[PDB]
Structure 1
């Protein structure tokens, strides 16, 4: 076991930084404690290359604070495929598939990261993903909207999703809120409402259906709220995973978007500007 001593201020900041990391959701309190003890802090300077495309993987990072740009060099040209804003994680691909870094991550401000060495990672996270794969691989392959992906790409979706459970009445997401997750209902029922004024029910999602994609596609705040009816289980994915893996089905989703407009105009007379 690898262990790094941390001040009290570090443990509080570390625990708060890890609370929403999807790759840690399917871990028991004991595996999680080992991960926490293995975490070490790392300061980064603005302009610093935390990760360079092509290198061997070494650590997995959870963001404590700071901004970062994501670059993928495609044919001598560097594209900015996204960014991180004071929250999130990265560097898990090289450690899961033993491949070279697939992108360059640069800090665009001073910041801090929580690192986790590859050994502790593969020993716990990777071991845990195998378990996750046995529970959901079948379910994910069967989703109609994911048929657009190559079969190998679909299997990779399982590696980065995390399970989230909600009790009856819990708010899953709120209208007007910023968005960082894409959801897939695993079990239970999710009620979608929108405020004209009072809240109006506009849709319900059952096993196999998704929601929370509109904000990620149009880059806007959540257009509606979502609450759980009874006990709900959702498979969540962060926006970076969404953009890396679901590009192939940005059509089927774009096609479902148009429907959102018609429905709202029909119910309210205005499209509420969701596009």
Structure 2
């Protein structure tokens, strides 16, 4: 059967200009989180978006015998059960089957958060109950807006990194598409001297201390302690050498306070943009400068 196209409502992703308040107790919110763990659209959302989304969920009180959703009807919301019992019914051809029930637990209508489509089953309350609802448009806008803000922010931290200045706009976006984020609590190790250099970091907040145990300096012995070679802050990057060589990490890196870094895998970087050395040479009048930065003194 010919498959028809689907389409959600369009929206200007780029933040218009700051211009949904539904109260919830800790237990209620905590319970909403649990009920949403496995839903694919929610499953891998960051801490912030999940919060904004739960914030947006409005309460819907239902009296017994009431129809929450009716098969065939257009759908706009997704619902989480707060209280009550409900019977689920599904009509196939001329037959209607009371297929299952919900007892103060459950959720349904997830598809409605994607695009407008017919309700596939009918849900009726069998007691006074309460449901948390979420409108598609509200849900999509919260998410897009946030991801478009994150993208602009990632874009900036890549752009201000001089090593990537010769990169084209589209090349920076490929990075933004896949680049990761990590939070480190003060004092915890980010990079360990000796292990394999697979990625590089770009500090977006906090500070990082780079230490080296002065032994790999001669022929067997010495210092065997801790020495700080460098100390990076917001906007700086470290682990850059993984982009141009393949030797174990020279030194260790520890978070100086609370840290947030953008983490990029070197192999992914190469598959996407090719080797870093070529990028550094793209702009020939800065090739030397770049080289001295990467393999130079300071």
Report which of the two structures shows the higher radius of gyration computed on alpha carbons: 2
Greater helix content: 1
What TM-score range do you get, normalising by the shorter chain? 0.3 to 0.5
